[PDB]
Amino acid sequence: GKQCFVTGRKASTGNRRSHALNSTKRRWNANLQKVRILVDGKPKKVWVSARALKSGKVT
Amino acid sequence: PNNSVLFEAINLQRASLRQGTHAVKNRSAVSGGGRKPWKQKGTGRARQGTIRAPQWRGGGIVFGPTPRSYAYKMPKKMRRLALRSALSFKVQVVDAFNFEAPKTKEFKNVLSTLKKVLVVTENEDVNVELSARNIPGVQVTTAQGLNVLDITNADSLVITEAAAKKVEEVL
Amino acid sequence: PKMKTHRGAAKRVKRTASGQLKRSRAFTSHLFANKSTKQKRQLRKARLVSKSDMKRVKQLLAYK
Amino acid sequence: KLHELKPAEGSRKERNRVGRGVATGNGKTSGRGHKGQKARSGGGVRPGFEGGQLPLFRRLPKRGFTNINRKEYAIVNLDQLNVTPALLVESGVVKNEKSGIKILGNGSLTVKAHKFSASAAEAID
């Protein structure tokens, strides 16, 4: 569905553990956020992860 | 001769010479099933679990054939002693064969002037094996390929002057 | 399938040069004010697993 | 001879075959006695189970550790000697130098080796 347009940031899936170590499946979403960027075909708006918009991509 | 070892050599060889390609289908393999036929409790019929169980017909073999090997081994020294005992009981020898062309009548004459014969030659003469593979009761081989089943199946041994020496060198 | 050893009994007992085993001694971990100096010193040694226990457990240590 | 074969007297026996009649001795119950957890296909309790009472090898304290650098040697006595480590291998004495050939002093009588017992270094001279 959603993933970083620039990087490949997906969501993972791990276990929410406990104190009794009773694990249950959880996910690990990526810090994805909409923003307008100059995809050189035209200015669009897309999902970008806050990591990937750390100093290296122009809005 | 050592009969206690020669028996095991023969039995070992006839065991090793089996395929073992024989199978059968148990509950897991027979088609269908996976449905209890009736309810187990109110019918009046016996309680059953599937129509492909052993007591039925058409389903299920409890044990039986499986594709499995039959050969086994035994020590090098016992192998060599069984071969020595077989030759020892044969003892209990001609010049070289001369066959330009494979001509079975020539070989039949050669066997008559001298019917379970085992004609043992040197490395391989490919006009004596051919001259002799059609006669019923005659088996030909070489000093590197002396079986124990071959030997003990034979009523006679016809080994050349060279094969006698090569087997005296081997064993 | 090789028969597996009992990896919790290999941490406890060893085999001697007669085919018999050399276990440790129980009652030697705490509550030492509740034992005689004889009973504390008599337990410091080691003993052999009895024949009954060579009955229950002898294939659990067949490689050891 | 291939039509009169005879295995050595005492080698072979016919297997025991249970559950076939009551005149063999192992027919009805087939050597299992009457009802119970051990007269059921699926075996009894696992070996070493002991029924609920805490088993032996969980009721005794653990003991020691294992050294990583354990140097076990090839033990030769002075009866084997009635001399490089290689010649001692190529004679048929040391079929494996585990760490090195150590010479001991049991028996009676030059030697290159990696260690020596006291009795050995005495009785070689």
Next chain:
RNA sequence: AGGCAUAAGGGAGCUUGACUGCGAGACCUACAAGUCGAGCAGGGUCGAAAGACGGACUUAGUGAUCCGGUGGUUCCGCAUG
């Protein structure tokens, strides 16, 4: 409950054997456990000495392993220190 007036009961002086390493042999015992023990070596206390002393007149007052803590130590410490 069994013994005790050898006192095992009472009083007084002196001290720390309420020791360290052990242990022939035996009782009990399904196992794990439990009980007794002459004698031997190191060090001593009492006594003038022989000697006695490894708790209490005897038998209850206790809880496997795993794991954690602390004190030492000769051991190990994943190329070497």
Next chain:
RNA sequence: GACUCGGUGAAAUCAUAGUACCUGUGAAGAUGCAGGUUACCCGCGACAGGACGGAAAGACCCCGUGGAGCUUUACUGUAGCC
């Protein structure tokens, strides 16, 4: 409807049966054992005392270190919510 006649024609049940009563005995309620008493061989219509009659591997009771559903301030968790 049943009953008799012509036509057609099942079913549950069923160890083999030449299948009596009584007083006993017996796994303590016998057609079948003991001791007695009674009964010539075969049907047909009818009744419902016994065959511990027949159907339904007792829905009761208890036992599975058996399941399932429900409850809660039982244990450990969890969607969610702050």
Next chain:
RNA sequence: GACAAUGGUAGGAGAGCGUUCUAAGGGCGUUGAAGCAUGAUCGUAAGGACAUGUGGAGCGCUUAGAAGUGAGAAUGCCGGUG
């Protein structure tokens, strides 16, 4: 020869019979194999022959080897029939 022993459930040990196939050897068979039916037969048992009918083309026997190796019980499965 003489003496001694020989009830048996759970269970332990030994010796055997029989079935299908395989190797070797040696045989039977359209002048009639296997099978089936009958029989008044031999063995301590599992069982083995023989004869006659029926049948129409394959089977024993010795010695070893290998097993899908023996059925009266599973409210067993399928078919037939009461």
Next chain:
RNA sequence: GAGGGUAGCGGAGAAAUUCCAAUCGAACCUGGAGAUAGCUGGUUCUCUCCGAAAUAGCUUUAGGGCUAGCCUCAAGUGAUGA
């Protein structure tokens, strides 16, 4: 009446644990799967020799199990058995 919609860790319920294809305190079908069953039932030929137990201890144990007691086969010691 016709045409449609809601589906099982679910749906509908004027509420009965009521309905969801003659089945519902959680449908049916196929797979994991030959689940597991310390429980019932069954377990196929002959002969020869020997021949028990229903007890102790511990047990989440009490119709189960483990060690010991009682049986059997082999080797040995060797008079130690009554």
Next chain:
RNA sequence: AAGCAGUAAAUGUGGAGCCGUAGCGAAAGCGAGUCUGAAUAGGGCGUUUAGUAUUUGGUCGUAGACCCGAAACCAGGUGAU
């Protein structure tokens, strides 16, 4: 042993590896002794001095493991005629 040769065969070759002739200790490490110990003092374990390879049978272990038989659980679908 795998491998290579060999008729889906024996069999030849293949010494990596395994078992054994040495044990004791947790270990360093000693070694016909060793560990505990101040001390063979005593004591534990050793010094039996034949093992090994293949296979017949008995039995056990991991695989459904003597056969039949649940109530149930999970996953993926088919169902509102």
Next chain:
RNA sequence: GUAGCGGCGAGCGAAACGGGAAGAGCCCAAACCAUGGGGUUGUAGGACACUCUCAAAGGACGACAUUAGACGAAUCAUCUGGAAAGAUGAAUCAAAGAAGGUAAUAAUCCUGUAGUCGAAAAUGUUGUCUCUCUUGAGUGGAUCCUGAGUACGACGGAGCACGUGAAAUUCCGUCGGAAUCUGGGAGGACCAUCUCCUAAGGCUAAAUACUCUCUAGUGACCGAUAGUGAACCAGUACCGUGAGGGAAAGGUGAAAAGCACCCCGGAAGGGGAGUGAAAUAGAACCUGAAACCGUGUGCU
């Protein structure tokens, strides 16, 4: 079944050395130069200086094999028979005595086998020559490059034989966040010293797993309740709304020679008469057991 991992329980359980099958290594980004060229690495390589000279991808080119086939040795006679391949005689072939069929049991009767030969054409592969490609190599070094929100840290997880542990080596999400050859990393926490390598770009055949599928074959594998559920027009009758479940069903004879004709009968079905070696082998057709149903009769 070792080291270890484990309510240290049930259990899980490596790897390197050693022996073997197979076996090749390479193209980039960066510096620099004029989209192109140059350059690809650890006993440091490249640039820069001299000197000294899979790997790029389209195409034709004769042999082998695969898809129909041809040849293919050598026997006659009596007894039984319904019928000879059998039994009894004499004989030949064998690089062919595998197998099947033929009125019975065949090396010589047929189809075959041993062996040799065969391709209009299509196709796959091996081969040469064509074809496209193509600058190789040492020495010195001031200096310029060698993969950055990357390595790594903290937190929460996953994975390593390894359960958060003293957890090294690898990944994921979230924040912070490095150096550049005396640089970086690893050697089971960690530091020092040594030893070995050079991350953060990419591509690679073989040794290996398996079987729809074609051809050739073997079996101490089954032989019609077996073997596939299906030897038979079978995933079919049938069952279900549906997903889906699912059977029973083989044999005349060597050859149909499969009963012309007559009689009873409405036909079916019979009894003769013929075919046949056999008809109680007459298509409900090889044998033809038992339960079960009958008719007759010796003893009661």
